[PDB]
Design a binder for these strands. Structure first.
Ligand SMILES: O=P(O)(O)O[C@H]1[C@H](OP(=O)(O)O)[C@@H](OP(=O)(O)O)[C@H](OP(=O)(O)O)[C@@H](OP(=O)(O)O)[C@H]1OP(=O)(O)O
Ligand SMILES: O=P(O)(O)O[C@H]1[C@H](OP(=O)(O)O)[C@@H](OP(=O)(O)O)[C@H](OP(=O)(O)O)[C@@H](OP(=O)(O)O)[C@H]1OP(=O)(O)O
Ligand SMILES: [Zn+2]
Ligand SMILES: [Zn+2]
Lengths: 397, 394
RNA sequence: UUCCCCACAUUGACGUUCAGUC
RNA sequence: GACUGAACGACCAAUGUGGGGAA
């Protein structure tokens, strides 16, 4: 099956694709096991499993499971947080990325902690200013099934024939932006009659829109996985690899993960359209039809236990904010910002100490973001949907 | 468990008609299976459609015959429409009926000497209509899943064991077949809409029950959207059950539960067909229920056997009943029909969903129906993800 | 009549074993 | 391998009946 064969990376090829895929799938699944009393725990129940793994060199056993997560559902509109205490998106892979961020903050704290630790940190000072990764370190993303949104919209028991080389005899656009529908694991296209969300309107019962994971990952393949805030310290980090435990299709997946916005232009220095290794695994999971657990589990290496969050409310069953919510990450960030000398910043601590404004200090990441949004529009693939601005207006302590 | 008569001038004898169409359908299934000895003669449920052309109960023709009890698996849904999503017998029988209707249109438009033989004729209102004596009667070897069958799935012991609890909330409720589970469940508990990737990920594919679907045929007609562009709404005159008949449940399910429907467009109405069990009720069919579903339309040489799990035949080939096939038929007739003869002349692109939307009135009827159910507190209709009907003919 | 709680039944997938057909 | 069939085990989320309550 030409549809069921690995797509090599436009990054660094340090391992062979299939050994790497089977490796990270095996490790992540194993580490979730260890975190759950050998899959016996109540919180081992899941529909989609994801994780992030790190490699330091060509030795494919140099690997570390960085983070592990499960989840297939999104916050209710009615339940959003004004102080950023809620998790808007608890799909497995989104959560994994967020935990990965915690690992990145810990690694900066490690470097800046003392000098003897700097040899142990994944980071180093960067010649261009700020920090950069060590010369060989790569991260790999694993999802137990293809990401929601465009990567999954296809008939897995029918041969592919999407777009012939000649201009489609009918019409174009087979990459459209799609959103999670509130109260569902599913995804629907974006309206071309695009109205924006408001804060008190959505809170009343109007549709909560969250971009699909396919669209989110593409975003990660343009602006990097660190997000805005961290980019003030560090240079853009991209996934080198994307491994799927099931529903793998090279044509569709390469389309969704980068190929559909290949018309992107004017990306700032260090930014690029990252085309990672794509691959499924040798022994793919079977579809289990049945109820998807209402919770989302997350773990970052260093942690003792996993954390269990009610996807609907974005907080845990006792209503306590997660270590992953905006407020928490801002906390980690503020701490790092304090431990970091001002001549070592990638941009300037100019703006106020509210979340959104501190995001705007990342001028370049912001610029990349705009090129991205524009890329989707000109590609005839729909306009991105952002949360209402009130979501990001809060302070700490 | 006694037949419920139809309209305001009675054209056939009830029990004679029931016994007639049951005998006929079951018999033609016989001829088609070399007297029930055939490999694919095994069945759990049988359905068929019979046409009558006049009162002479030997003027009857068996139009379609079918068997099947299962719905497609999630992984096997087709984005090109090559799959049969629902293979419960009576659903398939309706689809076979459609093939017959398309064929009749083709026959009418073929030439002038043939128009006399087609069941259709021009309508004063534009498009086509059935000739004045033509009726279709639906036969199922058992009560349709959903509202007619969920309560009292067993032979009535007669004595008129009428429902001891007719006013529960559960009565008349819309219900859906759930993938990987038994029974048929309210939609009120399934509040969100279906998605393609959600189903593919493992969320259970929901298919509307047969009871609800037939009620639907009793409002928007059995020809469906696409054919309604050519012809005026056609209804089943009779619904005959080879077993498990309970008049109260069947009548509630087939129409009475939506008698609150309003603003139906012209020619559309709440059809109340003849309901009846038969003289000699069928025996339960012994065995594991077969994974295949059989269909035959009058005219055909052979029957077709479709894998209910996959929606395609034993070799992975598309059925003559799938969306794609029917669209093909519709497109051919569409070209052969002069535009002054269409019931709707709104022009739309040649993708399936879009071509369905050209049936503006039918579409409207559909809306009155969904609302009827909703305001009656009987739940919201559940549709396939919107992706299912976005395909063209290559 | 309708609901509630408990108990017992009823009605498409899965696994095991056994027999077959291409 | 696919399909076909007969047993046995474990599900599925509705539904029935009963006893007991309640409006
Ligand atoms: O990982 P996610 O759950 O998708 O969170 C992201 C993330 O928000 P936080 O990092 O503040 O949690 C984005 O922030 P960046 O790091 O990319 O800046 C933000 O984008 P903006 O901050 O540019 O607005 C986007 O929110 P949205 O695109 O809806 O405004 C939001 O996604 P969710 O809102 O789906 O969480
Ligand atoms: O006999 P069925 O198997 O139930 O097929 C019908 C039929 O679809 P096709 O004729 O295209 O196969 C309906 O179309 P109409 O002819 O009634 O318009 C369609 O309804 P919509 O056109 O309103 O979408 C409905 O699908 P659904 O109602 O679930 O969207 C679908 O039934 P299944 O989807 O269960 O096959
Ligand atoms: Zn997702
Ligand atoms: Zn049925």
């Amino acid at each position: 099956t030409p549809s069921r064969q690995p797509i090599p990376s436009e990054g660094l090829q340090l391992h062979l694709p299939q050994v790497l895929a089977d490796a990270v799938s095996r490790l992540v699944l194993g580490k979730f096991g260890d975190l759950t009393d050998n899959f016996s725990s109540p919180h081992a129940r899941r529909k989609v499993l994801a994780g992030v793994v790190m490699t330091t060199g060509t030795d494919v056993k140099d690997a570390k499971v960085i983070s592990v997560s499960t989840g297939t559902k999104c916050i209710n509109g009615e339940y959003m947080s004004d102080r950023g205490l809620a998790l808007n998106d608890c799909h497995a892979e989104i959560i994994s990325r967020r935990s990965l961020l915690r690992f990145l903050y810990t690694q900066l704290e490690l470097y800046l902690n003392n000098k003897d630790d700097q040899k142990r940190s994944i980071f180093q000072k960067s010649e261009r200013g700020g920090f950069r990764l060590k010369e060989n370190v790569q991260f790999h993303l694993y999802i137990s099934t293809s990401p929601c949104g465009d990567a999954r919209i296809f008939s897995p028991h029918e041969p592919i024939l999407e777009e012939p080389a000649d201009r489609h005899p009918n019409r174009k656009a087979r990459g459209q932006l799609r959103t999670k529908i509130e109260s569902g694991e599913g995804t629907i296209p974006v309206r071309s009659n695009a109205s924006i969300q408001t804060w008190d309107g959505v809170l009343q019962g109007e549709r909560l829109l969250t971009m699909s994971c396919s669209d989110k990952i593409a975003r990660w393949n343009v602006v990097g996985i660190q997000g805005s805030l961290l980019s003030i310290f560090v240079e853009p980090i991209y996934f080198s690899s994307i491994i799927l435990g099931s529903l793998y299709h090279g044509d569709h997946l390469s389309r969704a993960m980068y190929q559909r916005i290949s018309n992107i232009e004017d990306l700032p220095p260090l930014y690029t359209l990252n085309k990672p290794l794509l691959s499924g695994i040798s022994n793919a999971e079977a579809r289990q039809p049945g109820k998807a657990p209402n919770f989302s589990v997350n773990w970052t290496v260093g942690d003792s236990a996993i954390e269990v969050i009610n996807a609907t409310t974005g907080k845990d069953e006792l209503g306590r904010a997660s270590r992953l919510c905006k407020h928490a990450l801002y906390c980690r960030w503020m701490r790092v910002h304090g431990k970091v000398p001002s001549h070592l910043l990638r941009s300037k601590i100019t703006k106020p100490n509210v979340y959104h404004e501190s995001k705007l200090a990342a001028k370049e990441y912001q610029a990349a973001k705009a090129r991205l949004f524009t890329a989707f529009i000109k590609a005839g693939l729909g306009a991105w949907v952002e949360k209402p601005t009130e979501q990001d207006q809060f302070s700490l302590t």
